[PDB]
Design a protein around this nucleic acid. Structure first.
Ligand SMILES: Nc1ncnc2c1ncn2[C@H]1C[C@H](O)[C@@H](COP(=O)(O)NP(=O)(O)OP(=O)(O)O)O1
Ligand SMILES: [Mg+2]
Ligand SMILES: [Mg+2]
Length: 425
DNA sequence: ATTTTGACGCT
């Protein structure tokens, strides 16, 4: 009763860009706007691999991971934009720079945690408290929430339903109680509307957002009404929402651990987890996972929004599939150099922009035949931003993987260089 | 022969 926490202490949002790389290319090239279109990497093999897909193209069944040649069979008028290639490899600079544009706008509203190239969590608890004091007991108008859905409502056309639900929600709010979690979430949603409007005004990019009491629910909420909408998931919405929510839809449960929860417990939906004790869950999934599941299935999570706007590592990777695997010393050294040159460029820019220097270089390879993604992953000192030195050091750290009696055996199917362990500069 | 990343957990 009175002593059981309900995980309603924070307001957390997750903002995620809609079909991000596609919007970057559509801003650049107006001919692609409002069209079925996709972003691809490479072009020779089956037209290139798709990494982002506009919503118009998704209506035809185009998805990420599809070869463009196959996507064209589903959507003959599909337009394509190709990722830049530099030094023989895909170069994602344009998208990293566009991400910085968006993150810098979001950071004006609150401290953000960069969760990926196109999404960030926001802890709005303080901003909501400030806005609630500003409002001075004033009711919140539906006009302040023009793109907000309230999950679970209405109860008891698309835009018509959205407005019905929002009206039910606002009608039910206790505006004069500044500690009401539902009121706090609603003010959070007002702020997120302002943030999303700022992003669109200042970059041209549209996005979706989730507003809830924690990161997992905010992330889940964000996807419920993509694109170009935001969704509020209240604590009270959790039992119904989770009662038919596949376990795999919750962040971190989309892989092996989620599969094991389903198999071991004989359940399908997140809400079914409430029928196990914390000790039972810890017994099957470990102390950490068990406690996390016990709270999460009740809508409770405590993972903080970490104050981190910049990536913690800077890496460069290339696969060499099938017959393109690297089989000569000259090939291996040339490609290590290419990767190191891109890495040097990004590191030098990072040092100038962000007042830090990486101190460790991680080298990873895969050998043809090896079932593992990586055959070797070894570190060495990163003491100077110099591509020839980094490539020589990477070769030094991997040369013993070569069985060859000038020849490289087994052929290499992947090279990877990653700068880590940043210090202030 | 989707690829190119990037955060975090385990031992
Ligand atoms: N498997 C992959 N490999 C490479 N790049 C990828 C990728 N998945 C995504 N990206 C890149 C390309 C993506 O544009 C970007 C963000 O990924 P999302 O947020 O998961 N998907 P999007 O924003 O496109 O659509 P929406 O969120 O509206 O559903 O990351
Ligand atoms: Mg996105
Ligand atoms: Mg995303």
């Amino acid at each position: 009763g009175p002593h059981m926490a309900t995980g309603q202490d924070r307001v957390v949002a997750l903002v995620d860009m809609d079909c991000f790389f596609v919007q970057v290319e559509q801003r650049q090239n107006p001919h692609l706007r409002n069209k079925p279109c996709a972003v691809v990497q490479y072009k020779s093999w089956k037209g290139g691999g798709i990494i982002a897909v506009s919503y118009e193209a998704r209506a035809f069944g185009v998805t990420r991971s599809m070869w463009a040649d196959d996507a064209k069979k589903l959507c003959p008028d599909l337009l394509l934009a190709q990722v830049r290639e530099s030094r023989g490899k895909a170069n994602l600079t344009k998208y990293r720079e566009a991400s910085v544009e968006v993150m810098e706008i979001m950071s004006r509203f609150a401290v953000i945690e960069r969760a990926s190239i196109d999404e960030a969590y926001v802890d709005l608890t303080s901003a909501v408290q400030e806005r609630l004091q500003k409002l001075q007991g004033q009711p919140i108008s539906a006009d302040l929430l023009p793109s907000t859905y309230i999950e679970g409502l209405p109860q008891g056309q698309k835009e018509g339903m959205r407005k019905q639900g929002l009206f039910q929600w606002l009608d039910s709010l206790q505006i004069d109680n500044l500690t009401s979690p539902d009121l706090q979430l609603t003010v959070g949603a007002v702020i997120v509307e302002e943030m999303r409007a700022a992003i669109e005004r200042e970059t041209g990019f549209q996005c979706s957002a989730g507003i809830s009491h924690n990161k997992v629910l905010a992330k889940l909420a964000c996807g419920l009404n993509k694109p170009n909408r935001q969704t509020l998931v209240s604590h009270g919405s959790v039992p119904q929402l989770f009662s038919q929510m596949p376990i795999r839809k919750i962040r971190s449960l989309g892989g092996k651990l989620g599969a094991s929860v389903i198999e071991i417990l004989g359940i399908e939906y997140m809400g079914e987890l409430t029928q196990f004790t914390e000790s039972q869950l810890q017994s099957h999934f470990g102390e950490k996972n068990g406690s996390w599941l016990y709270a999460m299935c009740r809508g409770i999570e405590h993972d903080p929004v970490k104050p981190r706007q910049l990536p913690k590592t800077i890496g460069c990777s290339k696969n060499f599939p099938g017959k393109t695997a690297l089989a000569t010393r000259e090939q291996v050294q040339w490609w290590l150099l290419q990767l190191a040159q891109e890495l040097e460029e990004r590191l030098t820019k990072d040092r100038n922009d962000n007042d830090r220097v990486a101190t460790q270089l991680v080298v990873s390879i895969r050998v043809q035949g090896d079932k593992r993604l990586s055959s070797l992953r070894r570190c060495c000192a990163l003491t100077r931003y110099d591509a020839h030195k980094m490539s020589h050091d990477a070769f030094t750290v991997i040369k013993n993987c070569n069985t060859s009696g000038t020849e490289w055996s087994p052929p290499l199917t992947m090279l990877f260089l990653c700068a880590t362990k940043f210090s202030a500069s």
